[PDB]
Structure formats: C-alpha cells, structure tokens
Symmetry: C3
Subunit: 273 residues, 3 copies
C-alpha cells in the first residue's frame, strides 16, 4: 500500500524478576507479542518503560533511522517511567537505478532490548525482553496460526526445563513457526514429522527452487527464521516432539510437543480418560 | 513409481562397547549402512534389537507415522531381543490444492537411535548408532561412489584421533559425500581442492542458481547435507585433506584424506616403493 | 578472458609478536591484503617467508594443484628465508559433457597459513596470517570500497577489545563486506541498519530469488561470505554498530562502527566541535 500504523508497547518487570514486553500494562509476555506488517507499512510504536532501569526496543531487519536503534550510544533508549516513539519502516522490493535489486523487508525478524544489564541488552534479553516480528510480502501464504519458539540460552521461551511449551493443531492446519535464538549458545532446532525449505518463507517456490529441505537447523544468538507446515501432512496425528538436537540440551530439557490431533480431538496413545 | 521395499536391520553391541546397526547380524558398521530410495518409495524395515538394553530407529526427513518415530513416549522403541517393523514413506513434490508447493522427500538424511542412555539417544548416538539415508528425485545425478562422513563429538565415524577415515578415488570419478554431525559440538567441515553448492544436491542447477559455492560449512548435532564432486577436477591428483576447521579439532585429530589417484594409481609424492 | 597475473607476497613477524602477510616487506597487515581476480584468471604468487619458522599460504575455493596446497604433508610450505611460487587458478561456470553444471570459482574466499604452530596453522592464524580473496564473475556489480571483517577467536582483525575497527562511508556509497571467521569459536555477525541476501553475492538476483534476507548470520572457523549494501539506504546517516551477537562476545568487545556520514560529512549526534 502501504499503511501507517500506530501501536503502544510497554516494558515491565514481572513479579519473579523476569521482564516482558506487552501491548497493555499487566499483560506482558515472554516472548513478547507478535508484530506483523506488510512491506510498505510504517509502524510508530509508542513505547513506555515502566521499569526502574533504562530499557529499549531494538529491531532486526526493518528500516529504522538511527534515532530508533534502541542504543545508549545513539540516545535511543528510555529512562525509567519514560515514553518514546520508535518508528519502524519497511519497503517493497524493486530495481534501483543502478540496475540491482533492492530486496524488500519481507522476512522473519525480531525485537529485543539493547540496554538492560549491559549496553548490548544481555540482562534484558536474558530476563525475557524479546519478541517476533513478521513482514509479509504481497501474495505470501498466510497461516491458521503462528507460534513463536525462542531458544534463550538453555531455555525455550524462558521456561523451566522439561515444561514445553507445547502447541496444538489438528491434522491439516497450516501452522507457522517463528524460530529465534538468543544468548550465549549455538543450538540445532529439530521437529519430528515435519520438514521445511531453508529459504525466506520456508516454502519452496516450485520445482526450480533448489533450496535444501530440512528438519534440523543450526542457529546462534539473534538468528531468526520461519516456516509453514501442514500439520500431520503425510504422517498423521501424534505427539510430535520438537527440540534442540544438541544432545545435552535435549537431555537437560530443551524439548516440547507439537500435539497434532485427529478430527476427534485425540492424540494416538494419549486419549483422555 | 513408487516401489514398496522390505529390509532387515539389526542393532548390536560390539566387543569394544560400541554399538552399530547392520543389515546382517555380525556385520554391524559405524556409521551404519546407507539406505537409498527414490521419492515415492515406501520402506518397511524389520528391525531387531539384539542388545540387552532398549533401542530404536529414528529417521530424519522421511514421512513416518507416530508409531515409527522411534521414541519411548510413543511406544515406538524395541525391547531387548525384540523385533518391530518401522515404516518410512516418501513423497514426490507437487502442487497442493491450496496452490502451494509440497517439497518432496528428496535429500540427504540420516537415522539414529533415540533411547539408549537417555530418551534422546545420547548413549546410542555416542556408541555408533547412526547412519545415512538418501532420497533421490527422478532425474538426480548418480555418483560412482558414496562416502559417509560423520562428525560425532570429537571423532570422525567414531575413529580414534588421526586415523582417518581415508577414501580413495581416481581423477575424474564422480564422488558423493553425505556429511552428518552428532553429539555436543559445532564443527566446520572443510575439503581441500574441491567445492560444492550449498543447496539440496550440492550441484548448481545452472547459471540462475544463486546458491553460495563453498568449501567450508558450519554444522551442528543432527545436521545433514550432501554433495557430489568430480575428483581432481581442475586441480589433479593428490592427498587432499578434509577436516574440521575448528583449529583445536583438526589439531586433536579430526582429519582424514581424500586420496585422488592418477590413472597410474599413484598419489603425487607418495608413490609405492 | 582470462588473464595470467603475477604478484609478490611476504610473511613477516611483527615487532609485537603477531605475524602478517603483505605485498611489500615492511607493509604487512592483519588482515592481509585483498587479492581480487576474475573467473578464468591465473595468479602466480611469488611468496617469500621472511620469518625464522616455516610458513605457508593455503587458499580456499580457488583451483590449486597439490603442490600449492600450503601443507607440510605435500611439501608445499616454505623454509625460513625461502621463496616459493604458488599458483592459484580459477574457472568460469559451464556445462560439463555429463550435462551437469560446473559452478565457477566466483565467490568470497580467503587465504591463511597452514604450518605455523601446528600443521593446521593454528599459531599462524592466531598471530594474523589470514586475508581475503574475491573472485568475480563477468557482470558482477563492483563496489565503491571493500572492507574485510575477520572474527579471529575473540577479536575482530586481531584488535584489542572495544577498539573497532571502524569503517566510514557516505549515504549512498556501495559498500562491500568480506566476512571471515577463524579459530576456536562460533559467532553471529550482525549489522545495524543494513541487510543482505544469504547467497553468493549477497544480492538477490530478482523477484524469483527465494534466498533469505538477513542481518545476522552464524559463522565458524574458516567460513567466508560477503555482500554489498547501499550505505544508509532507507535508514539515513548514523553510527551504525556491527558486532558479534553472542552476548558475552559483544560485551567483551567484539563491536565496531559503520560510520555512515551525511553529505556534510557528519554523523547525527556526533558532529565535530
Ligand atoms: Cu546490536
Ligand atoms: Cu541447544
Ligand atoms: Cu527426529
Ligand atoms: Cu539483535
Ligand atoms: Cu528427536
Ligand atoms: Cu570440529
Ligand atoms: Cu583448505
Ligand atoms: Cu535426530
Ligand atoms: Cu586445511
Ligand atoms: Cu562471537
Ligand atoms: Cu540489531
Ligand atoms: Cu582454511
Ligand atoms: Fe502453566
Ligand atoms: Fe583398520
Ligand atoms: Fe590506531
Ligand atoms: Na497486523
Ligand atoms: Na499427557
Ligand atoms: Na537402494
Ligand atoms: Na602414506
Ligand atoms: Na585485482
Ligand atoms: Na566519537
């Protein structure tokens, strides 16, 4: 189009010492809420830091001016109790005058804090100040649901070991995953029963797309990718594990379930009593 | 086509404490033997666990039902002395009704144990219960030979440091490599004298394939890729090293040789006496 | 064409104990100087080892015979004070008789020592014996400037923590980055304000190129990639950070600046007094 959109966000400290972003005070989540826009759109985010330490929003991929980089160095962070408007722009792909192709902002991206604990946001990220951003290209396939999976150090979504998260679908649902990594460690994301293309959308464009089809992918801090799968396609219903495949990581609890249900709402072998 | 194929496999403990898969009892190898099929084919594997601990077969990439996921959770592992038939299916690529492209099973994949030592197969994998699977697309180029190189923790194919393995070819042979990683560590696979495309087949489709041409690739646990090279192409005969390029890893013995011979059967500088 | 080119290079020890390559004695740098050629060209490098320990030149990607592999094993290293001519060839892409596509040498590559400290060049690499090589395809877009960024263990270009390097551009400059990793650690390279395509050239070929557009990329020892960006495109002037995104690495000093200036030569918020 594109559209000018406006949005409020808050950073807040949670009772247990974690920190989260939210669209409303008292409704902070880890990961933070999904921001989704179309190439061309501009997003003005009125950000309020409700915490007692400085905090910021820094985003990957999108077009922001230096005044919205979220760093102390560029005076782009937010004092305790303060408010700042960050502007994220996006563009559509197209040919420059030099004849090269400007790529477009479309992709799976993310936002996170850049000043809590250290000037690279090490404490903020660790505490939960991260969330996903999706930029869609005109004509991209849209899913029934999007789930965000973040490997943050040795946790998934800052959860305790062996507590998921778990996600549920029914055979045939189009499910989108946004997969983000943060912290200190490399990981390998693996899903049982499902595969995707290692390219922008996770979907091959057709028979001439030579991208590798995979079910396992090495990631490190601040990597983001995403894909769509048809739940149970060619494989049926089941409690399908996803996990980090680094062996000590899966053993120490970086595992969850993709619960793909039959049309009767049950998972083979785990029917309700 | 595709074809329904049947096959027997065994897991067995080896005299030195390692564990291996094989197509015949007493002929277990590490890595396990190569399974190769075409997109469309179904493979029914009659698996017998000859060991005194529970064991399983779990596969990447291929279409299996939950009853063949190889996990304790889905009652898909095999008691000591028991037998179970695992079914792996594959599909061809093509357009779904939703207009998106279903990708096909073609690729370089692998199988491994999922219950020895831990419920993620940490002990089994460590002991040698891993092997390669290749799914071919109609029209894929076939090689003269396929070699499997597995970086398993700080070993290549569970070998002692500085003992290879070494592989031999003659200048002009079409050689296929299946490269799998397991365990705890990230690695970088490097081959001297030879390069490949970072895509599904390791071969560029033509002048419009923008995939990076590389000779060095970061991998982590459960990653698999593969490629074909023409031995000695543009570079001639030689003892061409391959190794992990992580410096302490190569120094500690993650090195072997790709011995590419002249038509007289010799390697420059290392002629037999 | 291609062209036969000749060049002199030296390895030398620097007063502080580091080691560097150069085109002239007394002008060694870390990283070493950029070698750039076109597909088809042959480069004969007359290399002199001025140091008191054996040293070599080993290159990635390019077509070299075994006598130019730079290893002790193939008698391809250079005694103290000695001279050796290494030959690097390159080829253009095209169809083989077997109907497959030979890929071409084009890409972002690198050279480094293979015998100082260990027979994998661990000491040489650590001390600074590394540099970039670019092979261009006919018709590739050429930049205004090329900068080389090497993550060598926990340093950028062997620099002390928090000392850059910094690079400067003006809004609208076409800037090329060659990004190389060495040593023991995995890293994630991230640039604020700028993005590129994860493919050979870092530039999408057009609307049908499905390569992921990224601003963050995991790398390990001996990985090389490169890309071109338009400085400030869609984002304007600024002190744009680049850094490793592994959180302890950025905190410990793996950070520098891409200083993109307005047409008046200033950086927003950091104008000269
Ligand atoms: Cu940053
Ligand atoms: Cu992990
Ligand atoms: Cu699996
Ligand atoms: Cu970041
Ligand atoms: Cu698993
Ligand atoms: Cu390694
Ligand atoms: Cu090499
Ligand atoms: Cu696995
Ligand atoms: Cu080497
Ligand atoms: Cu790093
Ligand atoms: Cu950033
Ligand atoms: Cu190297
Ligand atoms: Fe709960
Ligand atoms: Fe032997
Ligand atoms: Fe200085
Ligand atoms: Na939206
Ligand atoms: Na349950
Ligand atoms: Na076969
Ligand atoms: Na020998
Ligand atoms: Na040149
Ligand atoms: Na300054």
């Amino acid at each position: 189009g594109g559209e000018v959109r406006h949005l409020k966000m808050y950073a807040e400290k949670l009772a247990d010492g974690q920190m989260g972003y939210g669209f409303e005070k008292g409704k902070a989540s880890v990961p933070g809420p999904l921001i989704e826009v179309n190439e061309g759109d501009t997003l003005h985010i009125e950000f309020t830091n409700t915490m007692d330490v400085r905090a910021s929003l820094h985003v990957h991929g999108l077009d922001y001016e230096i005044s919205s980089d979220g760093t102390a160095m560029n005076k782009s962070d937010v004092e305790p109790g303060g408010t700042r408007t960050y502007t994220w722009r996006t563009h559509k792909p197209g040919r420059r005058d030099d004849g090269t192709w400007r790529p477009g902002s479309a992709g799976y991206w993310h936002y996170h804090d850049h000043v809590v604990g250290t000037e690279h946001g090490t404490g903020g990220i660790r505490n939960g100040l991260y969330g996903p951003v999706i930029v869609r290209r005109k004509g991209d396939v849209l899913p029934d649901a999007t789930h965000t999976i973040v490997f943050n150090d040795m946790t998934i979504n800052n959860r305790k070991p062996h507590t998921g998260p778990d996600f549920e679908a029914t055979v045939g649902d189009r499910v989108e995953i946004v997969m983000i990594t943060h912290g200190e460690y490399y990981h390998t994301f693996h899903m049982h029963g499902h595969r995707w293309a290692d390219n922008r959308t996770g979907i091959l464009t057709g028979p001439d797309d030579p991208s590798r089809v995979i079910d396992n992918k090495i990631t490190g801090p601040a990597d983001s990718f995403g894909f769509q799968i048809i739940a149970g396609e060619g494989v049926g219903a089941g409690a399908w594990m996803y996990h980090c495949h680094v062996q000590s990581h899966s053993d120490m609890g970086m595992v969850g379930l993709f619960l793909v249900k039959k049309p009767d709402g049950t998972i083979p072998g785990y029917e309700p009593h």
